[PDB]
C-alpha cells in the first residue's frame, strides 16, 4: 500500500519484530484508526503504538494526503528511554523527512 511510507530505519529492522502478516494487520489497524497510537508530546504530533508477538512503532499521520510515515520500530526496554533532546531529534528526522513530500 502507498498509504504507508517506511523510513530507512523502519525498513531495516521491521522484520525483527513483525512477520508480513503481523505488519499488514498493523497497517489495517491504522487505516481504520489513524489516531490509534498515543501522541508523544514535544514531538509535533508523532504517535507511539504498542504491538504484541511486545514492540513499539512511532509514526506520523499526514491527514492532508492520507498517508502514514513510519519512523521507527523497536522493542520495549530496548531503546525505550526518551529525553528532551531525543524528542527534538525525532522532530528533525520527521520535519526533514516530511518537507519534500
Amino acid at each position, epitope marked *: 500500500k502507498s498509504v504507508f511510507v517506511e523510513s530507512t530505519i523502519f525498513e531495516k529492522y521491521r522484520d525483527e519484530y513483525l512477520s508480513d502478516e503481523e505488519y499488514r494487520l498493523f497497517q489495517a489497524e491504522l487505516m481504520l484508526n489513524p489516531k490509534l497510537g498515543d501522541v508523544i508530546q514535544g514531538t509535533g504530533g508523532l504517535r507511539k503504538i504498542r504491538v504484541a508477538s511486545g514492540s513499539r512503532i512511532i509514526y506520523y499521520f499526514l491527514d492532508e494526503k492520507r498517508r502514514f510515515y513510519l519512523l521507527t520500530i523497536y522493542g520495549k526496554n530496548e531503546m525505550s528511554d526518551l529525553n528532551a533532546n531525543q524528542r527534538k*531529534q525525532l522532530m528533525a528526522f520527521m520535519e526533514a523527512w516530511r518537507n519534500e513530500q
Partner: nanobody
Framework: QVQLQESGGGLVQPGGSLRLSCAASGFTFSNYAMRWYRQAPGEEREFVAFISSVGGSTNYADSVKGRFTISRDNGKNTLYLQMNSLKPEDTAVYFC??????????WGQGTQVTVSS
C-alpha cells in the same frame, strides 16, 4: 567517528566453525544493544542475532538458532558471533550493527563468510 570493524570471516568446509568478531570504536559500546545481520549475493539483508546492552538477553533468526551464539565483551568493546555446523546456506557477508538511537545506526563494512567443500 563511530566505527564497527568485523573480522573472522573465511572460506571454510561445510560442518566447520568460524568466530566473527566486531571491534567497536568511538562510542560507549556497553550502552547499546548489538546485532549481527547477513547478506547473500542477490538477496536482501537479513537479521541473524541480537544481544542486549549488558549481554544477558539474546535472540536469533530461526535458521541459525542452536548453531550460532552471539556474545559481547564490554571492556574490549567487541561483539562476537560463534558459528558452528556451518552450511552452504550460511554463505554471505556478515555485518556488525549498532542502533545508536531510535532513528540512527551504524553498520560495519562486513566480513565475508563462504561455506564450500
Amino acid at each position: 567517528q563511530v566505527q564497527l570493524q568485523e573480522s573472522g570471516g573465511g572460506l571454510v568446509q561445510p560442518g566447520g566453525s568460524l568466530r566473527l568478531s566486531c571491534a567497536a570504536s568511538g562510542f560507549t559500546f556497553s550502552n547499546y544493544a548489538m546485532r549481527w545481520y547477513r547478506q547473500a549475493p542477490g538477496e536482501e539483508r537479513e537479521f541473524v542475532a541480537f544481544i542486549s546492552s549488558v549481554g544477558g538477553s539474546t535472540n536469533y533468526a530461526d535458521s541459525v538458532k542452536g548453531r550460532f551464539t552471539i556474545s559481547r565483551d564490554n571492556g574490549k568493546n567487541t561483539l562476537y558471533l560463534q558459528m558452528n555446523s556451518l552450511k552452504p546456506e550460511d554463505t554471505a557477508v556478515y555485518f556488525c550493527v549498532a542502533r545508536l538511537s531510535l532513528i540512527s545506526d551504524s553498520w560495519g563494512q562486513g566480513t565475508q563468510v563462504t561455506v564450500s567443500s
